[PDB]
């Protein structure tokens, strides 16, 4: 149980909830100067699945924020409603959008209380948050099931996160990262990590966050808009095989 | 009578209270030194990861204008304790217009931690806190709080991985001589943090408070100067004079 | 039978309540002595580092201007019960406009031990004060059992200290002599050099309030040892 | 590659190889068992209906050696046939884990039943090397009777009973081995689905 | 063996062993004796000290001007039940302006102590009481048990080594009725003395007496007020 | 055993065992044609005494939403009531009939309420929720975990794998509501251990006109491999 | 220093050393195991068609000794190869603790399966030193047939059946040993990640 | 005084003694074991390529005696070295209690390894008293082979197989002993500071 | 009466009767244990650096019988001293109960160490009755060497090996015994208070 320490000062339910995320789909984020994006993989791959929704794993929380999740999905549907309530409570209280760190603190204060108060299970969900505010600009955060958030410039959660992290360490070009550069890196990291090869456009989900005339924008790239990103990858690594 | 419940043992112990201190013996080292008009604490850094914004890894956290705080242990319990102390720092100016003193809020935090060792269905806060600050009469203060709800006052202390080795350092070194000026009160903390550090200087973060100033976190342009001065004063004395 | 306070042994015993008693011997030792001139309290502090300010180790405290307490055991239990005693002594003043007796403070503080909070209090207390009935010394136990005592020792070396008090005590003593006897007993149950920071000492006389001794007054009795 | 090695193993010993043994057991092995049993009875009757003299120590009847060698062959064939099933099951015991071991218990149960069939029955009442036992125990008395010769009459009957009790032992060990084989057949044919794929992941409540 | 760790559990023989174990906690306290004439009711106890240089534990308690108890068992249960009795008597004087009968108090005590025997999460009261009182029906002596049962008695002793006092009282019951107060107190003291070793004897320090009657509120005599009642006891040999 | 407990692998075991109670219930088919949705299931009795016109595995929630299940009927009758209440709450606030996706969300919330406390077991049912909103058909699949999936066709219960491969090989768009019923009955005929009668199954369809449970006459009509 | 010693030992016995053994076992060790069974079966079928007289006690046959020496060499090499893996796994068992002992359980489980290989099959049915037991059993009969010899027929048949039974023992032990090598391979290849780093430093929720 | 005896005990044998043992184990003992394995494998290769006759029963090989004597001296020294560590740990097992026994478990667990290093690993395959066994087993054969000597040839080859199997035994025992020594080194270097002070008072929440 | 018997039995065996044993063990017994190992090493070095013939079989050495007799006299006194502690603890086991048995556990824990010492480690590697075990073996070898005088050389070497292995055995047993005595000293000195008065009933929470 979660209200019990180990002799070595450990909390093993909090570690098992964190081990319950590698079973979930891979989701990464990439920060840039022009914007910030997310990239999830759709393990819901089947000939009879419909895909009615706008997006299955990218959830919009505010006019200036979205999130992606990995882990237990019921827990995600709980936390995504709580996030949307926190944002609107801040708006009602101040009539200004909530910054992209107060929301993460507010959700992590909920996640911390489940590791501490008797008969309830820690949320087996990690999250990534992308958003804009008038204090620090474009941001990217990463929550854990223990109630620990951290700011990042590029991170990955879920299956094969430790490999995408090593790739981003070896290909991120801080200070010179546009949004086309970030998507070109995403299509690479998400192809050198997926078990199913060739990276079908049906098997991914991408969202970009940008600004236009003092308004925030959160779009979702369509199928044909991602086919181009894929086609401009095998060409790129076919040229890195020409020089034999 | 054994582990897994806060009941008792035949010896008269509560092992779930010791196993929480064992979590405070697992975080990063955090020291604190009390002077006359300067008070300095420093905390080891958390091994940055080449793609992380360190604006959010704040180990040192102010509670009011006169009081400050540094913690070791679980990172998330710290945030709740610090917010619940920040609230009381203002509720205390509501209940009586006077500001708060260091012992008041240390006592409050210790009572909050004590409250979580009383019931099952509640887990103790797995942190300690070095709570340094000022007062009216300008009396510098330093306290240390453990998960069990115990608080003392110290001239200098340490918490985390390596506190058992920094306590010997400050035993051998802390006198009235090393608190002559502010620059000697800071060099002591630098040398103490060196005893567990990466032999660097970029893995250090120090803050200070004066009777006049508010909290002032240092930049590496001064940490490097202090560390170079300390490396020079040790190349001359320990080596070139013995 | 050992774990849980709602479980009787076949012989009708509550082992958790006894293990709460055993938590007192893990605390340093304290001594209280009656005298018709007043009461004394004398304790060891057990400083673990020269860096800690020993004045932040509250092992003797004021409950009121006519009652002082000395404790041994868990710090948290002591904080709780000392706050209880302080609050009760002033509710009594508010209602009746008089000073609560030491017997009634002890009676009211022992009633919390009669509440299974889910755990017995791991702390014993000595209450020294002056009442209409003169100087009085009482002793409270985790079982909520309280009794008047002429001299009592609690804590780690309570057995040897009690086995000495039974010889050096008589019902004719003075306060300066009992203070000397207490520190002589305290000298013999310490592997540390007795000094004016390793101990506290307090007294409560009839015509004088609670008074914790100072370094000067302490050294001026350590010298005659 | 590592998975290549695991694949080379799991392709050499497949479910078809383990079922080919069960078919042969249910068809021919049991009838061979019963044939050896009736042969052992046919022989035991002869010794029960006979008088022995000093001449019978000068020669061993090949009628008994034939049944003992048939039981020898049967034991060898069944041992190899069962080690094939063991090898099929044991190259599929998956990653060690605290939990999700509802099919691992099935594998251990069937492996325990097969281990029983091997050790508790084949000797690897009487087991595989009964022929060595018979020839040693008889070669003792054949020397004690010839030299010179021993006048002990009970020894001459003890020779006869050495000849008889081994046929009886065969008749009982075959009867027991039939039961063991019939039990392994049911165990396999009921539990074979979780001997191959013991673990089955349900990731429906993950995203 | 393994129907013992809870009070809500029966055994296959139809017994609850936690209650039987709570009854064994009365045998750990010092001995008390209770007895009554037709005019007065008496409780005599034997007090016990923890350290020799301390005061003796108080064994008899005042509940009202016509009821009083002597306790053997756990101190905390006694301190809770006494505070229950006191408020139940004040509640009767407030409403009716009459003293509460003793039968109607011990019935309430039983109704109170019956709950921990049946619901889990509470401990049975490990204290036995001898209750002496006087009402419109004469004197009364009541025994109360950790089993939530209670008895009306001519006399009784409870606590450690109380069978000796009980054996004494059982063969002098025919005298207690027409005894005056001095003789009744002396019978109580002798029954109490029968619980001691031959080494020890009764003393001012270790004897408390409680008396209630028609023209006498419940008084307690502890240290030097006892010496009238001790004068008269034959110095027994062994 | 316990539900507020993770395994070291990071699995919730009682949920996995509640899905095993869904995997042993009667089969249920679901197909989403272009102009409708079909729901079909096996309603077979243990004797000629059971009156089949008294209980229903196909139930309406509104004029335009309907249900089937695989698993436990006692658990089904709770979620039917809850869905019928939630639809009416939505109507009371907005005076518009509830969309088929919001009901699935609010019902998976109810199924998730029973996954987080001790002293409660999850539901032993999965649902298939058909609808017709905004000129488009919908079909979802709610699970005891609190998770839902939108399908074009699927099958739950006994033999839910071969019954799904049959749909993968024998289902496409450019169908209509009558070509899909034949396919659903053919997908139920795989597991039917006996002669399929009008009373051994139960069918419900949704379209522009709304949800309707077909009658035994209409079932006997298409049971002849007709349409 | 002490960490110097632990590093010098853990750099002398690596996962590479324990995987080289595994791939050698999968490649060639098994092939030699079946070859020994081929030879043993052929020899058993040869001696089975024979008629032993007194000349066969005057000289030992060479084929049997060759097969047994081959088996002995195999068992020696496999013992050493298994002890290499034991060393690798055993110099990495971590600090003793009351919790986080899952990878330690994996380590002990694989070490139990190494014991099952070098305690029950190598004899460190029959194992390494069968070539000594064979010659002992042969000499005990040969001295009894040769000199004032003996005249028992069961003695000659016991000689013959000793020669047959030892080859059968070799044949069965080879099968039983293949079955265990093939299982050690699977266990290693499925659990090597936890046999090397059984505890993962996970202090993300600490400062 | 009684606490003076405790200190006179713990002053004689300290942690530095055990570390001194461990260092020489890691340095020279694990190089001297491989030397004996080498010298035994060479002798096995010698006798394996030999052909024995009556001349070899009239003399023992002077090489095997030296190899076995080396192994015996090594076993003796390792036994005494292990018992020094056993003493260092055993004179520090603290007051018996039912709680705070997490380091007492470390003590008792390292003692398991130290006793495993002796029970079936030094004989205090083969162990310390091996040379007497060799000489007895060989004398039993030379007596029969010399005399009117025995005429069995399988006995004449059993002589050779005796002289070979003991070198093989040494070769295996050396490998197993090296494994166990490395295991003890790892266990000690990981667990020593709770082997010395298994209990630490925590009276910080007491006055 | 009965209490008279209990107290007359307990005053005869007091805590002083055990502390005196502990004192003598810490003082002189360990030095005697060291001196026996010294002399055994001397005699072992003597036997190694010598060659044997027929003349050794005609009389035994005066050097080894002394060492063995001294070890015997040691073990006798150690047994008779351990039994005093055993009695002191065993006549103070309190009346049986299902609770309040935390000192009874200490009693039964130290009696287990005493049982590991006296009944087993003294043999009441080698024990007290080792001199007879030496003489019987050496007589078995001597009667074969003297007779027909066996001309086997391995027998004459086995003589020399018997004369050395027993000195080795004593040398090892003395080390092990010193370890166990040093363990028992600590076990007594850290627990003698609950070994005497295991139950204390100053019950203050009863009125």
Swiss-Prot record, chain B:
Residues bearing PTM Phosphotyrosine: 151
GO cellular component: cytoplasm; cytosol; extracellular exosome; nucleoplasm; nucleus; proteasome complex; proteasome core complex; proteasome core complex, alpha-subunit complex
Swiss-Prot/TrEMBL induction comment: Down-regulated by the ribozyme Rz3'X. Up-regulated in colorectal cancer tissues.
GO biological process, alphabetically ordered: proteasome-mediated ubiquitin-dependent protein catabolic process
UniProt GO molecular function: identical protein binding
Pfam families: Proteasome (PF00227), Proteasome_A_N (PF10584)
Post-translational modification note: Phosphorylation by ABL1 or ABL2 leads to an inhibition of proteasomal activity and cell cycle transition blocks.
Family, as annotated: Belongs to the peptidase T1A family.
The protein's name in its UniProt record: Proteasome subunit alpha type-7
Source organism (scientific name): Homo sapiens
Curated annotation (Swiss-Prot), chain C:
Glycosylation, residue list: 182
This protein's UniProt keywords: Acetylation, Cytoplasm, Glycoprotein, Nucleus, Phosphoprotein, Proteasome
Pfam families assigned: Proteasome (PF00227), Proteasome_A_N (PF10584)
GO terms of biological process kind: proteasome-mediated ubiquitin-dependent protein catabolic process
Residues modified to Phosphothreonine: 48
InterPro entries in UniProt: Ntn_hydrolases_N (IPR029055), Proteasome_alpha (IPR050115), Proteasome_alpha-type (IPR023332), Proteasome_alpha_type_5 (IPR033812), Proteasome_asu_N (IPR000426), Proteasome_sua/b (IPR001353)
Database matches in SMART domains: Proteasome_A_N (SM00948)
Family classification: Belongs to the peptidase T1A family.
Subunit structure: The 26S proteasome consists of a 20S proteasome core and two 19S regulatory subunits. The 20S proteasome core is a barrel-shaped complex made of 28 subunits that are arranged in four stacked rings. The two outer rings are each formed by seven alpha subunits, and the two inner rings are formed by seven beta subunits. The proteolytic activity is exerted by three beta-subunits PSMB5, PSMB6 and PSMB7. PSMA5 interacts directly with the PSMG1-PSMG2 heterodimer which promotes 20S proteasome assembly.
NCBIfam families assigned: PRK03996.1 (NF003075)
The protein, known as: Proteasome subunit alpha type-5
UniProtKB/Swiss-Prot annotation, chain E:
Chief location category: cytoplasm
Cross-link (Glycyl lysine isopeptide (Lys-Gly) (interchain with G-Cter in ubiquitin)): 112, 205
Segments traversing the membrane: none
GO-annotated cellular components: centrosome; cytoplasm; cytosol; extracellular exosome; nucleoplasm; nucleus; proteasome complex; proteasome core complex
Any single biological process term in GO: proteasome-mediated ubiquitin-dependent protein catabolic process
Matches recorded under Gene3D superfamilies: Glutamine Phosphoribosylpyrophosphate, subunit 1, domain 1
InterPro entries per record: Ntn_hydrolases_N, Proteasome_alpha, Proteasome_alpha-type, Proteasome_alpha1, Proteasome_asu_N, Proteasome_sua/b
SMART domains found in the cross-reference section: Proteasome_A_N (SM00948)
Glycosylation sites: 107
Pfam families with a match to the protein in the record: Proteasome, Proteasome_A_N
Modification Phosphoserine, positions: 107, 174
GO molecular function, one term: lipopolysaccharide binding
Record key words, sorted: Acetylation, Cytoplasm, Glycoprotein, Immunity, Isopeptide bond, Nucleus, Phosphoprotein, Proteasome, Ubl conjugation
Domain of life (superkingdom): Eukaryota
Cellular localization per UniProt: Cytoplasm; Nucleus
Record's note on what induces expression: Induced in breast cancer tissue (at protein level). Up-regulated in liver tumor tissues.
Subunit structure: The 26S proteasome consists of a 20S proteasome core and two 19S regulatory subunits. The 20S proteasome core is a barrel-shaped complex made of 28 subunits that are arranged in four stacked rings. The two outer rings are each formed by seven alpha subunits, and the two inner rings are formed by seven beta subunits. The proteolytic activity is exerted by three beta-subunits PSMB5, PSMB6 and PSMB7. Interacts with NOTCH3. Interacts with ZFAND1.
Homology family: Belongs to the peptidase T1A family.
Protein name according to UniProt: Proteasome subunit alpha type-1
Primary gene name: PSMA1
UniProtKB/Swiss-Prot annotation, chain F:
GO CC, one annotated term: cytoplasm
Phosphotyrosine carried by residues: 17, 69, 114
CDD domains listed in its UniProt record: proteasome_alpha_type_2 (cd03750)
InterPro entries: Ntn_hydrolases_N (IPR029055), Proteasome_alpha (IPR050115), Proteasome_alpha-type (IPR023332), Proteasome_asu_N (IPR000426), Proteasome_sua/b (IPR001353)
Organism domain of life: Eukaryota
Localization (cell): Cytoplasm; Nucleus
Gene Ontology biological process terms from the UniProt entry: proteasome-mediated ubiquitin-dependent protein catabolic process; response to virus
Post-translation changes: Phosphorylated on tyrosine residues; which may be important for nuclear import.
Residue positions where N6-acetyllysine is found in the record: 63, 164
Modification type Phosphoserine: residues: 7, 9
Main subcellular location of this protein, as a coarse class: cytoplasm
Induction notes from the record: Down-regulated by antioxidants BO-653 and probucol. Down-regulated in response to enterovirus 71 (EV71) infection (at protein level).
Keywords for this protein: Acetylation, Cytoplasm, Nucleus, Phosphoprotein, Proteasome
Keyword Phosphoprotein among record annotations: yes
Pfam families in UniProt: Proteasome, Proteasome_A_N
Family: Belongs to the peptidase T1A family.
Subunit architecture: The 26S proteasome consists of a 20S proteasome core and two 19S regulatory subunits. The 20S proteasome core is a barrel-shaped complex made of 28 subunits that are arranged in four stacked rings. The two outer rings are each formed by seven alpha subunits, and the two inner rings are formed by seven beta subunits. The proteolytic activity is exerted by three beta-subunits PSMB5, PSMB6 and PSMB7.
UniProt protein name: Proteasome subunit alpha type-2
């Amino acid at each position: 149980r979660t209200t019990i320490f180990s002799p070595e000062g450990r909390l093993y339910q909090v570690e098992y909830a964190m081990e319950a995320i590698g079973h979930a789909g891979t989701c990464l984020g990439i920060l840039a100067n022009d914007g910030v994006l997310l990239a999830a993989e759709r393990r819901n791959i089947h000939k009879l699945l419909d895909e009615v929704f706008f997006s299955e794993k990218i959830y919009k929380l505010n006019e200036d924020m979205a999130c992606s999740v990995a882990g237990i999905t019921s827990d995600a549907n709980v936390l995504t409603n709580e996030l949307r309530l926190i944002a609107q409570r801040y708006l009602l209280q101040y009539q200004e959008p909530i910054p992209c760190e107060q929301l993460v603190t507010a959700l992590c204060d909920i996640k911390q209380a489940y590791t501490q108060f008797g008969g309830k299970r820690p949320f087996g969900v990690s999250l990534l948050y992308i958003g804009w505010d008038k204090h620090y600009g474009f941001q990217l955060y990463q929550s854990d099931p223990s109630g620990n958030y951290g700011g990042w410039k590029a991170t990955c959660i879920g299956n094969n996160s430790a490999a995408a992290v090593s790739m981003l360490k070896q290909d991120y070009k801080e200070g010179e990262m546009t949004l086309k550069s970030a998507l070109a890196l995403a299509i690479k990291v998400l192809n050198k990590t997926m078990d199913v090869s060739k990276l079908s456009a049906e098997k991914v989900e991408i969202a970009t966050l940008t600004r236009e005339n003092g308004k925030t924008v959160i779009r979702v790239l369509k199928q044909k808009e991602v086919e181009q990103l894929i086609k401009k990858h095998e060409e790129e690594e076919a040229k890195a095989e020409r020089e034999k | 009578y054994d582990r897994a419940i806060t009941v008792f043992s035949p010896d008269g112990h509560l092992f779930q209270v010791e196993y929480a201190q064992e979590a405070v013996k697992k975080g990063s080292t955090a020291v604190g030194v009390r002077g006359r008009d300067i008070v300095v604490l420093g905390v080891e850094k958390k091994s940055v990861a080449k793609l992380q914004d360190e604006r959010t890894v704040r180990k040192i956290c102010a509670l009011d204008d006169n009081v400050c705080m540094a913690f070791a242990g679980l990172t998330a319990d710290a945030r709740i304790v610090i917010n619940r102390a920040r609230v009381e720092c203002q509720s205390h100016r509501l209940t009586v217009e006077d500001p708060v003193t260091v012992e008041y809020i240390t006592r409050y935090i210790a009572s909050l931690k004590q409250r979580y060792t009383q019931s099952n269905g509640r887990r103790p806060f797995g942190i300690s806190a070095l709570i340094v600050g000022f007062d009216f009469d300008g009396t510098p203060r330093l306290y240390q709080t453990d998960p069990s709800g115990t608080y003392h006052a110290w001239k200098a202390n340490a918490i985390g991985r390596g506190a058992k080795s920094v306590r010997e350092f400050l035993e051998k070194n802390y006198t009235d001589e090393a608190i002559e000026t502010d620059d000697l009160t800071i060099k002591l903390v630098i040398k103490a943090l060196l005893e567990v550090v990466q032999s660097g200087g970029k893995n250090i973060e120090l803050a200070v408070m004066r009777r006049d100033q508010s909290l002032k976190i240092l930049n590496p342009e001064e940490i490097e100067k202090y560390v170079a001065e300390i490396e020079k004063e040790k190349e001359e004395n320990e080596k070139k004079k013995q | 039978y050992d774990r849980g306070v709602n479980t009787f042994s076949p012989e009708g015993r509550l082992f958790q309540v006894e293990y709460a008693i055993e938590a007192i011997k893990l605390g340093s030792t304290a001594i209280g002595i009656q005298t018709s001139e007043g009461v004394c309290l004398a304790v060891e502090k057990r400083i673990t580092s020269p860096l800690m300010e020993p004045s932040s180790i509250e092992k003797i405290v004021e409950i009121d201007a006519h009652i002082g307490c000395a404790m041994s055991g868990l710090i948290a239990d002591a904080k709780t019960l000392i706050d209880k005693a302080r609050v009760e002594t002033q509710n009594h003043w508010f209602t009746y406009n008089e000073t609560m007796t030491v017997e009634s403070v002890t009676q009211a503080v022992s009633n919390l031990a009669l509440q299974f909070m889910s755990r017995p209090f791991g702390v014993a207390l000595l209450f020294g004060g002056v009442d209409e009935k003169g100087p009085q010394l009482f002793h409270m136990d985790p079982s909520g059992t309280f009794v008047q005592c002429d001299a009592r020792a609690i804590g780690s070396a309570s057995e040897g200290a009690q086995s000495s008090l039974q010889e050096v005590y008589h019902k004719s003593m003075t306060l300066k002599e009992a203070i000397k006897s207490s520190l002589i007993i305290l000298k013999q149950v310490m592997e540390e050099k007795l000094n004016a920071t390793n101990i506290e000492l307090a007294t409560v006389q009839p015509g004088q309030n609670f008074h914790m001794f100072t370094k000067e007054e302490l050294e001026e009795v350590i010298k005659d040892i | 590659k590592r998975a290549a090695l695991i694949q080379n193993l799991r392709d050499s010993y497949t479910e078809t190889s383990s079922f080919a043994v069960i078919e042969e057991w249910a068809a021919g092995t049991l009838q061979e068992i019963e044939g050896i049993a009736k042969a052992a009875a046919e022989a035991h009757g002869v010794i029960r209906n006979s008088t022995y003299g000093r001449a019978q120590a000068e020669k061993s009847p090949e009628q008994l050696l034939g049944v003992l060698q048939r039981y020898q062959d049967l034991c060898h064939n069944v041992y190899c046939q069962a080690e094939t099933i063991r090898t099929v099951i044991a190259i599929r015991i998956p990653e060690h884990k605290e939990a999700d071991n509802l099919g691992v218990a099935v594998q251990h149960a069937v492996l325990k039943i097969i281990d029983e069939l091997e050790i508790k029955t084949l000797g690897s009442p009487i087991g595989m090397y009964a022929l060595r036992e018979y020839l040693s125990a008889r070669s003792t008395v054949e020397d004690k009777l010839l030299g010179g010769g021993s006048q002990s009459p009970s020894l001459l009957l003890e020779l006869r009973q050495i000849d008889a009790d081994f046929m009886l032992k065969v008749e009982l060990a075959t009867t027991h081995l039939s039961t063991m084989v019939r039990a392994v057949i049911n165990a396999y044919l009921l539990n074979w689905k979780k001997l191959i794929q013991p673990r089955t992941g349900n990731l429906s409540y993950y995203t | 063996n393994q129907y013992d760790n809870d009070v809500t559990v029966w055994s296959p023989q139809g017994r609850i062993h936690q209650i039987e174990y709570a009854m064994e906690a009365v045998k750990q306290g010092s001995a008390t004796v209770g007895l009554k004439s037709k005019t007065h009711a008496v409780l005599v106890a034997l007090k016990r000290a923890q350290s020799e240089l301390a005061a003796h534990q108080k064994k008899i308690l005042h509940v009202d001007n016509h009821i009083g108890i002597s306790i053997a068992g756990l101190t905390a249960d006694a301190r809770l039940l006494c505070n229950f009795m006191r408020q139940e008597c004040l509640d009767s004087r407030f409403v009716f302006d009459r003293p509460l009968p003793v039968s109607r108090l011990v019935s309430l005590i039983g109704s109170k102590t019956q709950i921990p025997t049946q619901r889990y999460g509470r401990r049975p009261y490990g204290v036995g009481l001898l209750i002496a009182g006087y009402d419109d029906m004469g004197p009364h002596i009541f025994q109360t048990c950790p089993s939530a049962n209670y008895f009306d008695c001519r006399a009784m002793s409870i606590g450690a080594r109380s069978q000796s006092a009980r054996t004494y009282l059982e063969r002098h019951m025919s005298e207690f009725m027409e005894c005056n107060l001095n003789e009744l107190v002396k019978h109580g003291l002798r029954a109490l003395r029968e619980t001691l070793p031959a080494e020890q004897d009764l003393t001012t320090k270790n004897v408390s007496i409680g008396i209630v009657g028609k023209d006498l509120e419940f008084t307690i005599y502890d240290d030097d007020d006892v010496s009238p009642f001790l004068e008269g006891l034959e110095e027994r040999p062994q | 055993f316990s539900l507020t407990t993770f395994s070291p692998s990071g699995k919730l075991v009682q949920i996995e065992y509640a899905l095993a109670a869904v995997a042993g219930g009667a089969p249920s088919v679901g197909i989403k044609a272009a102009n409708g949705v079909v729901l079909a299931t096996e309603k077979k009795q243990k004797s000629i005494l059971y009156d089949e016109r008294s209980v229903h595995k196909v139930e309406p929630i509104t004029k335009h939403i309907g249900l089937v299940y695989s698993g436990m009927g006692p658990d089904y009758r709770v979620l039917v009531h809850r869905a019928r209440k939630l639809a009416q709450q939505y109507y009371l606030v907005y005076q518009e009939p509830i969309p088929t996706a919001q009901l699935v969300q609010r019902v998976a919330s109810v199924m998730q309420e029973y996954t987080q406390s001790g002293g409660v077991r999850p539901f032993g049912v999965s649902l298939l929720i058909c609808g017709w909103n905004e000129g488009r058909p919908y079909l979802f699949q709610s699970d005891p975990s609190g998770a839902y999936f939108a399908w074009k066709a699927t099958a739950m219960g006994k033999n839910y794998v071969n019954g799904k491969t049959f749909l993968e090989k024998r289902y496409n768009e450019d169908l209509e509501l009558e070509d899909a019923i034949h396919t659903a009955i053919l997908t139920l005929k795989e597991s039917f251990e006996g002669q399929m009668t009008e009373d051994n199954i139960e069918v419900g369809i949704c379209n522009e006109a709304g949800f309707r449970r077909l009658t035994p006459t209409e079932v006997k009509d298409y049971l002849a491999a007709i349409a």
